[PDB]
Amino acid sequence: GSSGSSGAGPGAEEEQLDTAEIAFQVKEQLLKHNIGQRVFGHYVLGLSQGSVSEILARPKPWRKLTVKGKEPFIKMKQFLSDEQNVLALRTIQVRSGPSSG
């Protein structure tokens, strides 16, 4: 691999997103700071634990998913557009319950 990229132009489209890559990269970033899928799916996604866990297990084709299928993946790929998103999630993994008073 290794090629390059040169083409500036930020934008606010919905586009096609590699769901298996988002799924992968999320698991990586959670592991990067040892975070759990529930807190990620509860905050970032707004789904149940069991819901995002399926999406992380079985990241069906972007073309297969509905808007209500793409909803999490949009939020996830946006999360992965900036590392501060995971850094802020580390706090929540403390504040998931009584990590002391």
Rounded to an integer, what is the distance from CA 8 to the centroid of its chain?
24
* CATH topology classification for 17-101: 434 Repressor (Amino-terminal Domain) (1.10.260)
Output phi, psi for 34, to 5 deg: 60, 35
Number of H helices, E strands in the chain: 5, 0
Burial of 36 (C-beta count, 10 Å sphere; 0-12/13-18/19+): middle
Those residues whose C-beta lies under 8 Å from the C-beta of residue 99, and which sit 6 or more positions away, are none
Rounded to an integer, what is the distance from CA 34 to the centroid of its chain?
15
Nearest to 14 by CA among 80, 75, 56, 58: 75
Instruction: For the chain, give every domain's residue range.
Output: 17-101
Nearest to 22 by CA among 100, 68, 80, 70: 80
Helix axes 19-32 and 49-57, enclosed angle (nearest 10):
120
Three-state SS annotation for 56-80: HHCCCCCCCCCHHHHHHHHHHHHHH
Rounded to an integer, what is the distance from CA 15 to the centroid of its chain?
16
What technique was this entry resolved by?
Answer: NMR
